[PDB]
Design a protein around this ligand. Structure first.
Ligand SMILES: Nc1ncnc2c1ncn2[C@@H]1O[C@H](COP(=O)(O)O)[C@@H](O)[C@H]1O
Ligand SMILES: O=C(O)c1ccccc1O
Length: 536
Protein backbone atom coordinates (compact mmCIF):
# COMPACT_ATOMS: atom_id res chain seq x y z
CA UNK A 1 0.00 0.00 0.00
CA UNK A 2 1.37 3.40 -1.08
CA UNK A 3 0.17 6.96 -0.41
CA UNK A 4 0.37 7.82 -4.13
CA UNK A 5 -1.11 6.09 -7.13
CA UNK A 6 0.33 6.53 -10.61
CA UNK A 7 3.89 5.27 -10.06
CA UNK A 8 5.73 1.98 -10.46
CA UNK A 9 7.41 0.44 -7.38
CA UNK A 10 10.46 -1.77 -7.55
CA UNK A 11 9.92 -5.55 -7.66
CA UNK A 12 10.01 -6.97 -4.15
CA UNK A 13 13.13 -9.01 -4.95
CA UNK A 14 15.06 -5.83 -5.81
CA UNK A 15 13.69 -3.92 -2.82
CA UNK A 16 14.91 -6.71 -0.51
CA UNK A 17 18.40 -6.63 -2.02
CA UNK A 18 18.66 -2.85 -1.72
CA UNK A 19 17.50 -2.94 1.90
CA UNK A 20 19.86 -5.83 2.67
CA UNK A 21 22.83 -3.99 1.08
CA UNK A 22 22.22 -0.91 3.25
CA UNK A 23 21.17 1.36 0.36
CA UNK A 24 17.56 1.79 1.54
CA UNK A 25 17.92 2.59 5.21
CA UNK A 26 14.23 3.13 5.98
CA UNK A 27 14.36 6.81 6.98
CA UNK A 28 12.12 9.63 5.67
CA UNK A 29 13.95 12.23 3.63
CA UNK A 30 13.32 14.92 6.25
CA UNK A 31 15.22 12.89 8.89
CA UNK A 32 18.56 13.99 7.37
CA UNK A 33 17.85 17.46 8.76
CA UNK A 34 16.30 16.18 12.02
CA UNK A 35 19.33 13.94 12.70
CA UNK A 36 21.92 16.61 11.83
CA UNK A 37 20.16 19.27 13.93
CA UNK A 38 20.08 16.84 16.87
CA UNK A 39 23.80 16.15 16.59
CA UNK A 40 25.05 19.61 15.56
CA UNK A 41 22.28 22.11 16.45
CA UNK A 42 24.48 25.21 16.49
CA UNK A 43 26.49 24.61 13.32
CA UNK A 44 25.69 27.03 10.49
CA UNK A 45 23.48 25.17 8.01
CA UNK A 46 22.49 27.84 5.51
CA UNK A 47 23.72 31.22 4.25
CA UNK A 48 21.79 33.30 1.74
CA UNK A 49 23.20 35.78 -0.76
CA UNK A 50 22.71 38.76 1.58
CA UNK A 51 24.78 37.12 4.33
CA UNK A 52 21.95 36.04 6.62
CA UNK A 53 22.67 32.81 8.43
CA UNK A 54 20.77 29.92 10.04
CA UNK A 55 21.88 27.12 12.32
CA UNK A 56 20.73 23.53 11.97
CA UNK A 57 18.50 23.96 15.03
CA UNK A 58 16.96 27.12 13.58
CA UNK A 59 16.27 25.44 10.22
CA UNK A 60 14.82 22.34 11.89
CA UNK A 61 12.56 24.50 14.08
CA UNK A 62 11.35 26.68 11.20
CA UNK A 63 10.58 23.61 9.08
CA UNK A 64 8.44 22.30 11.96
CA UNK A 65 6.56 25.60 12.27
CA UNK A 66 5.90 25.88 8.55
CA UNK A 67 4.78 22.23 8.48
CA UNK A 68 2.24 23.04 11.19
CA UNK A 69 1.10 26.11 9.26
CA UNK A 70 0.68 24.04 6.09
CA UNK A 71 -1.53 21.57 7.93
CA UNK A 72 -3.66 24.50 9.13
CA UNK A 73 -4.26 25.32 5.44
CA UNK A 74 -5.23 21.72 4.64
CA UNK A 75 -1.94 20.91 2.88
CA UNK A 76 -0.81 17.51 4.08
CA UNK A 77 -0.61 13.74 3.76
CA UNK A 78 -0.25 12.95 0.06
CA UNK A 79 -1.10 16.35 -1.42
CA UNK A 80 1.06 17.36 -4.37
CA UNK A 81 2.41 20.92 -4.20
CA UNK A 82 4.08 22.64 -7.17
CA UNK A 83 7.13 24.58 -5.96
CA UNK A 84 8.75 27.27 -8.14
CA UNK A 85 11.20 29.28 -6.07
CA UNK A 86 14.51 31.13 -6.43
CA UNK A 87 17.74 30.31 -4.59
CA UNK A 88 16.67 31.73 -1.24
CA UNK A 89 16.20 30.38 2.28
CA UNK A 90 12.44 30.19 1.67
CA UNK A 91 12.87 27.15 -0.58
CA UNK A 92 15.02 25.24 1.91
CA UNK A 93 12.63 25.78 4.83
CA UNK A 94 9.58 24.99 2.70
CA UNK A 95 11.13 21.82 1.24
CA UNK A 96 11.43 20.23 4.67
CA UNK A 97 8.13 21.72 5.87
CA UNK A 98 6.27 20.05 2.99
CA UNK A 99 7.98 16.71 3.66
CA UNK A 100 7.09 16.87 7.35
CA UNK A 101 3.49 17.84 6.59
CA UNK A 102 3.29 14.74 4.39
CA UNK A 103 2.94 16.70 1.16
CA UNK A 104 4.79 15.66 -1.99
CA UNK A 105 6.81 18.55 -3.51
CA UNK A 106 6.62 18.83 -7.30
CA UNK A 107 9.80 20.75 -8.11
CA UNK A 108 9.80 23.17 -11.05
CA UNK A 109 12.35 25.73 -12.14
CA UNK A 110 12.03 29.54 -12.05
CA UNK A 111 12.17 29.60 -15.87
CA UNK A 112 9.08 27.43 -16.29
CA UNK A 113 5.95 29.12 -17.57
CA UNK A 114 2.24 28.41 -18.01
CA UNK A 115 2.60 25.45 -20.38
CA UNK A 116 4.94 23.54 -18.05
CA UNK A 117 3.28 24.65 -14.81
CA UNK A 118 -0.24 23.81 -15.95
CA UNK A 119 0.80 20.38 -17.25
CA UNK A 120 2.60 19.31 -14.09
CA UNK A 121 -0.14 20.73 -11.83
CA UNK A 122 -2.83 19.00 -13.89
CA UNK A 123 -0.87 15.73 -14.00
CA UNK A 124 -0.09 15.69 -10.27
CA UNK A 125 -3.54 16.92 -9.25
CA UNK A 126 -1.71 19.57 -7.25
CA UNK A 127 -3.65 21.32 -4.51
CA UNK A 128 -1.19 24.19 -4.02
CA UNK A 129 1.41 26.21 -5.91
CA UNK A 130 4.33 28.12 -4.36
CA UNK A 131 5.94 31.03 -6.22
CA UNK A 132 7.91 34.25 -5.68
CA UNK A 133 6.19 37.51 -6.42
CA UNK A 134 8.50 38.92 -9.12
CA UNK A 135 11.65 37.12 -10.29
CA UNK A 136 14.00 38.23 -13.06
CA UNK A 137 11.35 40.67 -14.28
CA UNK A 138 8.50 38.15 -14.38
CA UNK A 139 5.44 38.34 -12.14
CA UNK A 140 4.78 34.73 -11.11
CA UNK A 141 1.50 35.81 -9.45
CA UNK A 142 0.06 36.37 -12.92
CA UNK A 143 1.22 32.85 -13.79
CA UNK A 144 -0.44 31.51 -10.63
CA UNK A 145 -3.74 33.12 -11.66
CA UNK A 146 -3.47 31.45 -15.06
CA UNK A 147 -2.62 28.09 -13.49
CA UNK A 148 -5.60 28.26 -11.13
CA UNK A 149 -7.95 29.03 -14.02
CA UNK A 150 -6.66 25.96 -15.89
CA UNK A 151 -6.26 23.64 -12.89
CA UNK A 152 -9.24 23.69 -10.52
CA UNK A 153 -7.44 21.49 -7.97
CA UNK A 154 -5.09 24.35 -6.95
CA UNK A 155 -6.71 25.79 -3.83
CA UNK A 156 -3.78 27.67 -2.27
CA UNK A 157 -1.11 29.91 -3.73
CA UNK A 158 1.74 30.66 -1.32
CA UNK A 159 3.94 33.63 -2.27
CA UNK A 160 7.55 34.24 -1.21
CA UNK A 161 7.04 37.96 -1.26
CA UNK A 162 4.11 40.33 -1.70
CA UNK A 163 1.23 37.85 -1.69
CA UNK A 164 -1.44 40.03 -3.37
CA UNK A 165 -4.76 38.17 -2.92
CA UNK A 166 -2.89 34.93 -2.13
CA UNK A 167 -1.15 33.64 1.02
CA UNK A 168 2.24 34.97 2.09
CA UNK A 169 4.61 32.03 2.56
CA UNK A 170 6.02 33.76 5.66
CA UNK A 171 2.57 33.64 7.30
CA UNK A 172 2.53 29.83 6.90
CA UNK A 173 3.64 29.39 10.49
CA UNK A 174 2.17 27.77 13.59
CA UNK A 175 3.15 26.09 16.82
CA UNK A 176 4.72 22.72 15.95
CA UNK A 177 2.43 19.71 16.17
CA UNK A 178 3.11 15.95 16.22
CA UNK A 179 3.14 14.71 12.62
CA UNK A 180 3.36 11.07 11.61
CA UNK A 181 6.37 9.93 9.61
CA UNK A 182 5.77 8.78 6.02
CA UNK A 183 6.56 5.28 4.81
CA UNK A 184 10.16 5.38 3.49
CA UNK A 185 9.14 3.30 0.45
CA UNK A 186 6.63 5.94 -0.64
CA UNK A 187 7.21 8.77 -3.11
CA UNK A 188 8.91 11.68 -1.34
CA UNK A 189 8.95 14.19 -4.21
CA UNK A 190 8.36 14.51 -7.95
CA UNK A 191 11.10 15.82 -10.26
CA UNK A 192 10.62 17.14 -13.78
CA UNK A 193 12.41 15.88 -16.88
CA UNK A 194 12.39 17.52 -20.29
CA UNK A 195 11.73 14.14 -21.76
CA UNK A 196 11.10 13.18 -25.35
CA UNK A 197 7.30 13.28 -25.73
CA UNK A 198 4.69 16.01 -26.12
CA UNK A 199 4.49 16.80 -22.40
CA UNK A 200 7.08 17.08 -19.60
CA UNK A 201 7.39 13.94 -17.51
CA UNK A 202 7.35 13.65 -13.72
CA UNK A 203 9.83 11.40 -11.91
CA UNK A 204 8.79 9.87 -8.57
CA UNK A 205 11.67 9.63 -6.09
CA UNK A 206 11.10 7.68 -2.88
CA UNK A 207 12.44 8.50 0.57
CA UNK A 208 14.72 5.45 0.52
CA UNK A 209 16.18 5.94 -2.95
CA UNK A 210 16.63 9.72 -2.71
CA UNK A 211 18.27 9.44 0.72
CA UNK A 212 20.63 6.86 -0.80
CA UNK A 213 21.25 9.11 -3.81
CA UNK A 214 22.19 11.91 -1.37
CA UNK A 215 24.18 9.79 1.09
CA UNK A 216 26.19 7.80 -1.47
CA UNK A 217 26.87 10.97 -3.51
CA UNK A 218 28.16 12.75 -0.41
CA UNK A 219 30.51 9.81 0.20
CA UNK A 220 31.92 9.75 -3.34
CA UNK A 221 32.39 13.54 -3.39
CA UNK A 222 34.05 13.75 0.04
CA UNK A 223 31.32 15.95 1.50
CA UNK A 224 31.43 16.32 5.27
CA UNK A 225 31.06 18.95 7.99
CA UNK A 226 33.84 21.14 6.57
CA UNK A 227 32.16 21.33 3.16
CA UNK A 228 30.83 24.75 2.19
CA UNK A 229 28.65 24.11 -0.87
CA UNK A 230 27.55 26.93 -3.19
CA UNK A 231 24.17 26.36 -4.84
CA UNK A 232 24.74 27.82 -8.31
CA UNK A 233 22.14 25.83 -10.26
CA UNK A 234 18.49 26.19 -9.16
CA UNK A 235 17.82 24.58 -5.79
CA UNK A 236 15.19 22.42 -7.56
CA UNK A 237 17.74 21.03 -10.03
CA UNK A 238 18.56 17.42 -9.05
CA UNK A 239 22.30 18.10 -9.51
CA UNK A 240 22.32 20.95 -6.97
CA UNK A 241 19.66 19.40 -4.73
CA UNK A 242 20.96 15.88 -4.27
CA UNK A 243 24.17 14.98 -6.19
CA UNK A 244 25.24 15.59 -3.43
CA UNK A 245 23.99 19.19 -3.60
CA UNK A 246 22.42 20.99 -0.69
CA UNK A 247 20.76 17.88 0.75
CA UNK A 248 24.13 16.09 0.93
CA UNK A 249 25.65 19.15 2.57
CA UNK A 250 22.89 19.30 5.20
CA UNK A 251 23.02 15.53 5.78
CA UNK A 252 26.72 15.66 6.70
CA UNK A 253 26.61 18.95 8.60
CA UNK A 254 28.33 21.30 6.17
CA UNK A 255 27.19 24.78 5.16
CA UNK A 256 24.90 25.56 2.20
CA UNK A 257 25.49 28.93 0.51
CA UNK A 258 22.83 30.13 -1.94
CA UNK A 259 24.00 31.94 -5.09
CA UNK A 260 21.37 34.19 -6.73
CA UNK A 261 22.96 33.78 -10.19
CA UNK A 262 25.96 31.90 -11.65
CA UNK A 263 27.64 35.12 -12.80
CA UNK A 264 31.22 35.62 -11.58
CA UNK A 265 30.02 38.86 -9.98
CA UNK A 266 27.76 36.90 -7.63
CA UNK A 267 29.49 33.51 -7.41
CA UNK A 268 33.12 34.67 -7.05
CA UNK A 269 32.14 37.11 -4.30
CA UNK A 270 30.33 34.36 -2.39
CA UNK A 271 33.22 31.91 -2.85
CA UNK A 272 35.60 34.43 -1.33
CA UNK A 273 33.19 35.67 1.36
CA UNK A 274 32.01 32.27 2.60
CA UNK A 275 35.15 30.22 1.75
CA UNK A 276 33.17 27.90 -0.51
CA UNK A 277 34.84 24.50 -0.95
CA UNK A 278 32.53 22.82 -3.50
CA UNK A 279 30.00 23.73 -6.18
CA UNK A 280 28.30 22.29 -9.26
CA UNK A 281 27.83 23.96 -12.65
CA UNK A 282 26.91 23.16 -16.26
CA UNK A 283 29.64 23.47 -18.94
CA UNK A 284 28.59 26.93 -20.22
CA UNK A 285 29.09 28.30 -16.70
CA UNK A 286 32.37 26.39 -16.32
CA UNK A 287 33.66 28.05 -19.50
CA UNK A 288 32.52 31.45 -18.23
CA UNK A 289 34.32 31.03 -14.89
CA UNK A 290 37.44 29.63 -16.57
CA UNK A 291 37.53 32.83 -18.65
CA UNK A 292 36.57 35.23 -15.86
CA UNK A 293 39.45 34.43 -13.47
CA UNK A 294 41.70 36.26 -15.92
CA UNK A 295 40.05 39.61 -15.09
CA UNK A 296 38.34 39.02 -11.71
CA UNK A 297 40.40 39.59 -8.56
CA UNK A 298 38.29 37.40 -6.24
CA UNK A 299 40.21 34.97 -4.03
CA UNK A 300 38.82 31.56 -5.02
CA UNK A 301 41.53 29.57 -3.20
CA UNK A 302 39.03 27.94 -0.83
CA UNK A 303 37.47 26.06 -3.73
CA UNK A 304 38.43 22.38 -3.63
CA UNK A 305 35.86 20.70 -5.90
CA UNK A 306 34.11 21.83 -9.08
CA UNK A 307 31.50 19.39 -10.36
CA UNK A 308 30.61 19.85 -14.02
CA UNK A 309 27.64 18.08 -15.57
CA UNK A 310 24.33 18.43 -17.34
CA UNK A 311 26.19 18.13 -20.62
CA UNK A 312 29.62 16.82 -21.58
CA UNK A 313 32.55 19.03 -20.62
CA UNK A 314 35.20 18.91 -23.34
CA UNK A 315 38.68 17.60 -22.59
CA UNK A 316 40.38 20.91 -23.41
CA UNK A 317 38.47 23.07 -20.85
CA UNK A 318 38.53 20.13 -18.40
CA UNK A 319 42.34 20.25 -18.44
CA UNK A 320 42.20 23.98 -17.57
CA UNK A 321 40.20 23.57 -14.32
CA UNK A 322 43.17 22.98 -12.02
CA UNK A 323 45.49 25.70 -13.47
CA UNK A 324 42.72 28.31 -13.76
CA UNK A 325 40.49 27.60 -10.75
CA UNK A 326 42.89 25.81 -8.39
CA UNK A 327 40.55 22.92 -7.62
CA UNK A 328 39.77 19.34 -8.55
CA UNK A 329 37.36 18.72 -11.43
CA UNK A 330 34.68 16.07 -11.08
CA UNK A 331 32.75 15.17 -14.21
CA UNK A 332 29.17 14.16 -13.45
CA UNK A 333 26.92 12.40 -15.97
CA UNK A 334 23.55 12.17 -14.25
CA UNK A 335 19.81 12.36 -14.68
CA UNK A 336 16.79 13.16 -12.55
CA UNK A 337 15.60 9.67 -13.55
CA UNK A 338 18.32 8.18 -11.35
CA UNK A 339 21.73 6.88 -12.51
CA UNK A 340 24.67 9.09 -11.53
CA UNK A 341 28.17 8.67 -12.93
CA UNK A 342 31.04 10.41 -11.12
CA UNK A 343 34.72 10.69 -11.74
CA UNK A 344 36.38 9.93 -8.43
CA UNK A 345 38.27 12.71 -6.69
CA UNK A 346 41.59 10.85 -6.87
CA UNK A 347 41.13 9.41 -10.36
CA UNK A 348 44.18 10.04 -12.53
CA UNK A 349 43.83 13.39 -14.28
CA UNK A 350 43.52 11.49 -17.59
CA UNK A 351 40.16 10.03 -16.55
CA UNK A 352 38.89 13.27 -15.04
CA UNK A 353 39.69 15.04 -18.32
CA UNK A 354 38.51 12.38 -20.79
CA UNK A 355 35.58 10.55 -19.15
CA UNK A 356 32.21 11.32 -17.61
CA UNK A 357 32.72 9.04 -14.59
CA UNK A 358 31.55 5.62 -13.48
CA UNK A 359 28.30 4.63 -11.73
CA UNK A 360 27.68 5.68 -8.13
CA UNK A 361 26.30 2.38 -6.80
CA UNK A 362 27.75 -1.16 -6.90
CA UNK A 363 24.25 -2.26 -7.91
CA UNK A 364 23.84 0.25 -10.71
CA UNK A 365 23.39 -2.06 -13.69
CA UNK A 366 24.31 -0.75 -17.13
CA UNK A 367 23.75 -2.14 -20.62
CA UNK A 368 25.01 -0.63 -23.87
CA UNK A 369 22.95 -1.81 -26.82
CA UNK A 370 22.92 -1.40 -30.60
CA UNK A 371 19.93 -0.45 -32.76
CA UNK A 372 18.57 -4.01 -32.69
CA UNK A 373 18.67 -3.99 -28.88
CA UNK A 374 21.71 -6.26 -28.63
CA UNK A 375 24.63 -5.66 -26.28
CA UNK A 376 27.56 -4.01 -28.04
CA UNK A 377 31.06 -5.42 -28.06
CA UNK A 378 33.20 -4.05 -25.20
CA UNK A 379 34.28 -0.50 -26.02
CA UNK A 380 31.73 0.02 -28.82
CA UNK A 381 29.26 2.91 -28.82
CA UNK A 382 25.58 2.15 -28.14
CA UNK A 383 22.59 3.36 -26.20
CA UNK A 384 22.83 3.27 -22.42
CA UNK A 385 20.13 1.40 -20.49
CA UNK A 386 20.28 1.30 -16.73
CA UNK A 387 18.62 -0.15 -13.64
CA UNK A 388 19.49 0.33 -9.99
CA UNK A 389 18.60 1.30 -6.43
CA UNK A 390 17.70 4.91 -7.26
CA UNK A 391 16.66 4.71 -10.95
CA UNK A 392 12.91 4.88 -11.53
CA UNK A 393 10.85 1.95 -12.81
CA UNK A 394 8.37 4.31 -14.45
CA UNK A 395 7.38 7.93 -14.82
CA UNK A 396 4.47 9.26 -12.78
CA UNK A 397 1.04 8.75 -14.38
CA UNK A 398 2.54 8.06 -17.83
CA UNK A 399 1.76 4.43 -18.67
CA UNK A 400 2.01 4.80 -22.46
CA UNK A 401 5.43 6.46 -22.28
CA UNK A 402 6.55 3.90 -19.68
CA UNK A 403 5.70 1.08 -22.11
CA UNK A 404 8.08 2.64 -24.67
CA UNK A 405 10.82 3.81 -22.30
CA UNK A 406 11.52 0.85 -20.00
CA UNK A 407 12.46 -2.64 -21.12
CA UNK A 408 10.44 -5.62 -19.96
CA UNK A 409 12.92 -6.40 -17.16
CA UNK A 410 12.91 -2.80 -15.95
CA UNK A 411 15.88 -1.13 -17.66
CA UNK A 412 15.43 2.59 -18.28
CA UNK A 413 16.37 3.61 -21.84
CA UNK A 414 18.35 6.82 -21.25
CA UNK A 415 18.62 7.83 -24.90
CA UNK A 416 22.32 8.62 -24.41
CA UNK A 417 25.05 7.11 -26.60
CA UNK A 418 28.06 6.00 -24.56
CA UNK A 419 31.14 3.79 -24.51
CA UNK A 420 32.31 1.93 -21.42
CA UNK A 421 36.06 1.80 -20.88
CA UNK A 422 38.00 -1.10 -19.33
CA UNK A 423 38.04 0.74 -15.96
CA UNK A 424 34.25 1.06 -16.02
CA UNK A 425 34.33 4.81 -16.73
CA UNK A 426 31.87 6.05 -19.36
CA UNK A 427 32.51 8.37 -22.29
CA UNK A 428 29.42 10.19 -23.55
CA UNK A 429 29.41 9.96 -27.34
CA UNK A 430 26.07 11.48 -28.39
CA UNK A 431 22.34 10.99 -28.12
CA UNK A 432 19.69 8.75 -29.61
CA UNK A 433 16.68 10.54 -28.10
CA UNK A 434 14.85 13.40 -29.86
CA UNK A 435 15.75 15.98 -27.22
CA UNK A 436 18.09 18.96 -27.58
CA UNK A 437 20.62 19.67 -24.81
CA UNK A 438 20.99 23.46 -24.87
CA UNK A 439 23.65 24.38 -22.34
CA UNK A 440 22.32 21.75 -19.95
CA UNK A 441 18.66 22.59 -20.58
CA UNK A 442 16.71 19.69 -22.09
CA UNK A 443 14.26 20.48 -24.89
CA UNK A 444 11.77 17.80 -25.92
CA UNK A 445 11.55 18.25 -29.69
CA UNK A 446 8.02 16.84 -29.91
CA UNK A 447 6.70 19.21 -27.21
CA UNK A 448 8.25 22.26 -28.83
CA UNK A 449 7.07 21.17 -32.29
CA UNK A 450 3.47 20.94 -31.07
CA UNK A 451 3.69 24.47 -29.63
CA UNK A 452 5.14 25.82 -32.88
CA UNK A 453 2.52 24.12 -35.04
CA UNK A 454 -0.15 26.00 -33.07
CA UNK A 455 1.11 29.17 -34.78
CA UNK A 456 -1.33 30.08 -37.61
CA UNK A 457 1.47 30.38 -40.17
CA UNK A 458 2.84 26.88 -39.50
CA UNK A 459 1.59 23.58 -40.91
CA UNK A 460 4.42 21.29 -39.79
CA UNK A 461 7.45 21.76 -37.56
CA UNK A 462 10.65 19.77 -37.01
CA UNK A 463 13.02 20.88 -34.25
CA UNK A 464 16.68 19.97 -34.89
CA UNK A 465 19.77 20.51 -32.76
CA UNK A 466 22.80 22.28 -34.19
CA UNK A 467 26.26 21.98 -32.60
CA UNK A 468 27.52 24.98 -30.63
CA UNK A 469 31.02 25.34 -29.23
CA UNK A 470 29.96 26.84 -25.89
CA UNK A 471 26.26 25.91 -25.66
CA UNK A 472 26.73 22.33 -26.84
CA UNK A 473 23.58 22.51 -28.95
CA UNK A 474 21.30 25.24 -30.21
CA UNK A 475 17.73 24.83 -31.45
CA UNK A 476 16.65 25.18 -35.07
CA UNK A 477 12.93 25.08 -35.89
CA UNK A 478 12.37 23.80 -39.43
CA UNK A 479 8.98 25.01 -40.65
CA UNK A 480 6.61 24.05 -43.45
CA UNK A 481 4.28 27.06 -43.85
CA UNK A 482 0.55 26.67 -43.59
CA UNK A 483 -1.05 26.51 -47.04
CA UNK A 484 -1.05 29.97 -48.60
CA UNK A 485 0.41 31.52 -45.44
CA UNK A 486 3.75 33.03 -44.53
CA UNK A 487 5.61 31.31 -41.72
CA UNK A 488 6.91 33.45 -38.83
CA UNK A 489 10.52 34.51 -38.44
CA UNK A 490 12.52 33.86 -35.26
CA UNK A 491 11.42 36.93 -33.30
CA UNK A 492 7.68 36.58 -33.98
CA UNK A 493 7.85 32.87 -33.18
CA UNK A 494 9.68 33.60 -29.93
CA UNK A 495 6.99 36.12 -28.97
CA UNK A 496 4.22 33.66 -29.85
CA UNK A 497 5.83 30.90 -27.78
CA UNK A 498 6.48 33.17 -24.80
CA UNK A 499 2.85 34.34 -24.83
CA UNK A 500 1.81 30.68 -25.02
CA UNK A 501 3.73 30.02 -21.79
CA UNK A 502 6.79 28.21 -23.12
CA UNK A 503 9.96 28.41 -21.02
CA UNK A 504 12.52 30.75 -22.56
CA UNK A 505 15.26 28.13 -22.97
CA UNK A 506 13.00 26.31 -25.45
CA UNK A 507 12.70 29.31 -27.81
CA UNK A 508 14.28 28.34 -31.16
CA UNK A 509 17.63 29.96 -31.91
CA UNK A 510 17.04 29.78 -35.68
CA UNK A 511 14.13 29.32 -38.11
CA UNK A 512 14.45 27.56 -41.48
CA UNK A 513 11.46 27.46 -43.86
CA UNK A 514 11.03 24.61 -46.32
CA UNK A 515 8.27 23.03 -48.38
CA UNK A 516 8.73 19.53 -46.96
CA UNK A 517 10.75 17.44 -44.52
CA UNK A 518 12.99 14.53 -45.48
CA UNK A 519 11.55 11.22 -44.35
CA UNK A 520 12.95 7.75 -43.83
CA UNK A 521 11.20 4.79 -45.48
CA UNK A 522 8.69 4.41 -42.66
CA UNK A 523 8.41 7.37 -42.91
CA UNK A 524 9.26 9.48 -39.91
CA UNK A 525 10.95 12.84 -40.41
CA UNK A 526 14.67 12.28 -40.92
CA UNK A 527 16.35 14.68 -38.51
CA UNK A 528 19.77 13.33 -39.44
CA UNK A 529 19.15 14.66 -42.96
CA UNK A 530 17.47 17.85 -41.71
CA UNK A 531 20.70 18.69 -39.89
CA UNK A 532 22.51 18.40 -43.22
CA UNK A 533 19.95 20.50 -45.11
CA UNK A 534 20.27 23.14 -42.38
CA UNK A 535 24.03 23.21 -43.02
CA UNK A 536 23.84 23.02 -46.83
N1 LIG B 1 28.27 15.04 -17.81
C1 LIG B 1 27.28 14.88 -18.74
N2 LIG B 1 27.63 14.67 -20.02
C2 LIG B 1 26.73 14.49 -20.99
N3 LIG B 1 25.40 14.51 -20.80
C3 LIG B 1 24.91 14.71 -19.57
C4 LIG B 1 25.83 14.92 -18.43
N4 LIG B 1 25.04 15.09 -17.33
C5 LIG B 1 23.75 15.01 -17.75
N5 LIG B 1 23.67 14.78 -19.08
C6 LIG B 1 22.44 14.65 -19.89
O1 LIG B 1 21.33 14.95 -19.08
C7 LIG B 1 20.37 13.87 -19.16
C8 LIG B 1 19.61 13.79 -17.87
O2 LIG B 1 18.75 14.90 -17.71
P1 LIG B 1 17.17 14.70 -17.69
O3 LIG B 1 16.90 13.77 -18.86
O4 LIG B 1 16.64 16.11 -17.90
O5 LIG B 1 16.90 14.14 -16.32
C9 LIG B 1 21.23 12.66 -19.48
O6 LIG B 1 20.48 11.56 -19.98
C10 LIG B 1 22.24 13.23 -20.46
O7 LIG B 1 21.66 13.35 -21.75
O1 LIG C 1 19.68 16.21 -14.78
C1 LIG C 1 20.90 16.45 -14.97
O2 LIG C 1 21.26 17.02 -16.02
C2 LIG C 1 21.92 16.04 -13.93
C3 LIG C 1 23.27 16.29 -14.15
C4 LIG C 1 24.21 15.91 -13.19
C5 LIG C 1 23.80 15.30 -12.02
C6 LIG C 1 22.45 15.05 -11.79
C7 LIG C 1 21.52 15.42 -12.75
O3 LIG C 1 20.17 15.18 -12.52
Amino acid sequence: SHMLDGWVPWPESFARRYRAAGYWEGRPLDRLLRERAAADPDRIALVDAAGDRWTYAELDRHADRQAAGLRRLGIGAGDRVVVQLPNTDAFVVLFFALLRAGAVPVLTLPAHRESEIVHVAETAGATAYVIPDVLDGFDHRALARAARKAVPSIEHVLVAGEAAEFTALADVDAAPVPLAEPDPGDVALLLLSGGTTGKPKLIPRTHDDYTYNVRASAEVCGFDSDTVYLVVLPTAHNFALACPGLLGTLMVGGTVVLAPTPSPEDAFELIEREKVTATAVVPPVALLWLDAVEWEDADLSSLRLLQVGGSKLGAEPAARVRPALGCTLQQVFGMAEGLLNYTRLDDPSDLVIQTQGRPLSPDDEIRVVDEDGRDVAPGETGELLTRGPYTLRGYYRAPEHNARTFSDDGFYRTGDLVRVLPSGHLVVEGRAKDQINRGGDKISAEELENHIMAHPGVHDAAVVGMPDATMGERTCACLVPRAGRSAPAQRELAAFLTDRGVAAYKLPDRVEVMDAFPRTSVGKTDKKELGRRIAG
